[model samples]
Target chain A: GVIGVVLNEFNASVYLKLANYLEKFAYNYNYNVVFCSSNDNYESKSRYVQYFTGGAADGLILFGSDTRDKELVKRILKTGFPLVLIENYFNDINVNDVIINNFSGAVNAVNYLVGLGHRKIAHITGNVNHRAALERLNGYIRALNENGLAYSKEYVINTDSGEQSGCKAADQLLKLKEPPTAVFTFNDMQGYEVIQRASELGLSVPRDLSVVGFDNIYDIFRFIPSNVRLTSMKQPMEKVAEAAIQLMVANIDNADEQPKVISFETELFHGTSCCERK
Target chain B: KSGVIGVVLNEFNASVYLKLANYLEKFAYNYNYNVVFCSSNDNYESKSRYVQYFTGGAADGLILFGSDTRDKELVKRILKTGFPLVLIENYFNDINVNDVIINNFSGAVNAVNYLVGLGHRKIAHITGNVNHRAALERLNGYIRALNENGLAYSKEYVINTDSGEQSGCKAADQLLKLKEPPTAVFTFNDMQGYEVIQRASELGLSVPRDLSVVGFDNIYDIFRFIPSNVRLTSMKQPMEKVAEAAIQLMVANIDNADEQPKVISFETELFHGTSCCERK
Candidate 1:
C-alpha cells in the first residue's frame, strides 16, 4: 500500500534530485511515501527499517553508501520487502541496485587532469566506507597506473563530503611537504570548498593546483570563485530518478518478483580548471 | 600602532562579517584599525584556545558575528584583559558587549502572522539546521502565530533542513504527504527555499497554488530565482543597517575605548510577493 524510502542527509545534490523525483512518483502511483532521514548515521539506518515495517511500507528505497554493509543488507533483506538501493550497488545484496558510474567518471576526470600536464595529483576522497568513494578511488588508481605514475600515500585525503572537510583537506594537501600540482575530489560540493581554501592559500588554480570534481549538480556557482573554470563530471540525476521510480513502481506493480539492478552513465564536464599539456 | 585584532568565528559564512572585513580594510586604511577574518568552522575547542592567543596583543578590536561565537569564557578573558569588541547579530543577549543583531522575534512573527492574515491557516515551517539561533526564533514565531490563530501545530507539517542542496525540497515533499497538508511554508533561509521552489516546479507543483512560500534573509539571489508569477514573500533585514551598526560599534569602541558591552537591535520589513495569497 505504501513505499518506505529511508534517505540519508538530503543536503547533497544527488539526494535532492532523488527526493524531488520520488515525490512526483508518489503522486502518479497513489502510493503513500514515508520518508526517514538517517542524517548519515548508523543508528538511524536501524531505526528506518523498524519505522518502515511498522508503517507497513510495501517496499523501500534505501539511500546509503557504506552504511549498508553486507550484514546490514542481509538484515534489510530479512524483512522480505522488495528494496531499491541508491548510490551503492552491491550485487552481493538481494536488493535491487541503482548507481551512477562513479568509476568511469573518476577515471575520465584523472585522465583529463593528466592531459592537462598535471603529473603529480592529489585526491580528496569521500568517506572511506562508501562504495561510490571506493569506486572513484579505484578509478584514480587505474589512471595513475596506466600513466606509469606511482600513487603516493600522501596524495590521498579522506573527506566527509562536506565543504568544511574540503577546507581541511586543502589545508593538509597544500601544506604538505610537497603538494601535488593538481587535485581531484570525490564530488563537487567538496570541490567548492577546495576552491575557497585554495583561494586562501593564494595558489592560483590551473597554474598552481588544477582541481577536478565529480557531479556537476549545483557546482556551477562553485565554479564562480575560481579564476579558471572548475572541471567536473556531470550525472543525469533526473534520468536516474526516472529509472528509480520506474523500477520502484514496477516492483510494486509486479508484486516484488524480480530485483532490478540498474546503472546510469555520466560525462566529463570540462571547465577551465585544467590547462593543456605542454 | 598595531591594535589587537579580535576576530570572531566565521561559521555559516556569515556574509555580514565578510562585508565588515571589506569595510574594515577600507576603514583600516583610513582610521588606522587593523582587522582580520577569523576562519573558524565549528572547531569549538580550537576556536576557544585561539581566541585568547589571538587577542593577546594580536589586534585591537574583536569583531564577532552570530550569537554563539568562539568561546564566551575566552571572550570574558579578552574583556578582563580590556580588549575592545564589536559584535554582530549575536552579543545582544550579552548586553555587556557592544552588539548588533536583527529583531528576530518581530521579523519572524511578522512573516508568519502576515501569511496567516493572507488566509493560510495551515502553515508549514521549514527551519535551518540546529545551528542558527535566529532560525530558532523564527520557528517560535511561526508556532506562536498558529497558536494565536487557534490552529493546531501538527508535527507532520514541520520540516527541518540544514544547509544543504535539497533538504528544503525534501521538507516540501514530506509536508505534501501530511494528512492535512499545509498550503504555505515559511523557511528559515533562502537557499533551502530556493531549492524547494526548484523541486516544486520540477514536480509540476505550482507556487502559491499548491503551496505558498515565505523566506527570510533577503539574499539577492533569492529574488531572481522565483518567477514573478509565483511571488515569494521575503522578510528583509536591511544589510545597510547591519553594516552601519557594525561600523558604529567598531568606531564607538575605538572612540570610547570602553570594554562595556552594548547591544543594538536592528529592524526588518516583510515584503509581500506573489508566492503568498490572501486566505482562500
Candidate 2:
C-alpha cells in the first residue's frame, strides 16, 4: 500500500518531474508513496532508511541519492524488503537499479558541440559529491581526449546544482581570456541559467556561446525562448521511474529475485542552442 | 515567433498539475507548438507575475488551472482582450470563460457515501485552501453527503486548514485525539489526506481497521514507506480528460475568437483504494 521515496531534494525541478512520473506509476500499481528528502546529508538519508525498514513502507525507491552510508543500504537488501534505486547504484553489490549513463550523455553533448566545430568547450559541473557529476566530468575529459582537444582546467567551473550556479559559471567562462565557443552544463536547470546570463551580457545563444544541458526538462521553463532553448540530453525519466517501481515491486515479492541493473541512453534534443562555431 | 502555449497551474508539487502539464505539452506538441509552464504556488505575487508574463505576444495562448480570487483582476484583463485562454479545475463564477472544471461536489459526495456505506457514522474532513472554489464545493458536498445519509454535521468533524501549516498538522491531532475519534476521515485534497493516514498510523491505528481515511485527488503517496498498500482511497481527478478538454477549448477559442464561451465539467471517480472499510 505504501512505499517510501528517498531523494536528494523534492524542490529541485528535475526531481519534481521524476517524482511526478513515479507517483503516476505508483497510482497505476495501486500503491501509496511517502517521500523523504535527504538534502544530500548522511543523517537524513539514514533516518528514512530506518523508517522504511521499521515497517514504514512496503517498498522503497532511492532517487538520485549519493549517500555515503553504503553499509546501511547493503544491510537493507540483506533483509529482502523490496527496494529499488533510480540513479545511485553500489559496486559489487547486486541490487535493482534504473539509471541513465550520465557519462555517455555528457560525452554525446560535447561530441555534438565538437561536431559543430567547437574546439574550446567549457564544462559547468554539478555538485562535486554526485556520482553523475563525476561521471559527466570524466566523459567530458574522455571526449576531449578522443577529439585531440586540449582540456583546460580553467574551462571547468565547479559548483553545486544551485539555481544561480549556471549564471555565475557562464559569467566566469565568458570573462576568460580565451573563452570557449560552447558550454555544456550538468542539467537543463544550469543550462537555462547559462543562456540567461549570456542573454544579459547581450550575447545571443548559439551566436556568442552555445550551451548543452543534461535532462531535457529544459522546455518547462517560461524564461527560455524556444529559439534558444537548451540543447539537452533527454534522459528517459518516465521509463526510468516506471522501471524502478516495477523492479521495487518485484524485489519486494521475491528477495531472491536476481538483482537487475537497467540502464538507459540519453537522446540529444537540438533546440537551436548549439550551432557551428563562428 | 514560434507559436508558444503558456501553462500556469496552482502548484507543480501537486502531481496532478504536473500530470496536467505533461498532457498539455503532448497536445501542444501535437500542434507543433512549444510550451512554457509556471507554478503560481497559490500566491498573489506569483500568480500575477506568471499571468502578466504569459499574456503578451510572447505567448499565443494560455492554460490556467485552479485559479480563484487572486487571479480575478488578471483573468479579467485577459478576458477583456479576448486573449485565447482556457481554465481547468476552477474559474470565477458569473464570468463566462472557456474553462474545464470537475464535479468536485459529486466526488466529495461519493467519497463520503463510500465511508457511510461502510457503516461509519463519525467521519472527519480536512479542508483545502479556503479561497479555492473547489475547496468550498468539496466542503459543501461533504455536508450534503452527511445530510443525505441522516448524519448530523458537527464543527468538530470539519477541520479548516486554510489558516496554514499548523492546521495542516493540527487537524490530524485534533481529529485523532478526540474522546470518541471519528472512525473515518475525508480530506479536501490528497495532500491533507496524507496527514490523516500518517497520523492514524503513528498513533498505532491500522487504517480501515481502527480508522478509515479518504483523500480527494486520487493522488496516492509517491514515496510512502508504509508496510501495506499506501494508495489512499481518493477521488480521481481525470487528468487526461481534463487536459483534452482544456487544450481543445484553447485551440477552439484561438480559431474562433468571438465564439461563445464554453464551460466543460468532468466527473471524478473514487479510486476504491485500501484506506476505508466497514465501521467496526
Give lDDT tens digits, candidate 2, residues B117-236: 999999988898767777888999999999999999999988887834334357888988888888888888765665566566667876678888898766533321121234578888
Off by over 4 Å in 2: A1-14, A17-278, B9-11, B39-53, B163-168, B221-228
* Candidate 2 chain A minimal-lDDT segment of 10 residues: A218-227
Interface RMSD (one decimal) of model 2: 19.2
**Cα lDDT for residue A263, candidate 1:** 87
lDDT of 1 at B38: 37
Model 2, A57-137: lDDT tens per residue? 688777655456577778777777787877775675777889889899988999999999999998999886778898999
Show model 1 residue runs off by greater than 4 Å: A9-13, A25-34, A38-51, A54-56, A66-73, A89-92, A148-150, A158-163, A175-178, A217-229, B1-280
* A-chain TM-score, model 1: 0.79
Per-residue lDDT value at B132 in model 1: 69
For model 1 chain B, where is the 10-residue window of minimal lDDT?
A: B220-229
lDDT of 2 at A147: 91
- How far in Å is the alpha carbon of B180 misplaced in model 2? 2.3
* Candidate 2 displacement at residue B146 in angstroms: 0.9
Q: What TM-score fits each model?
A: 0.48, 0.51
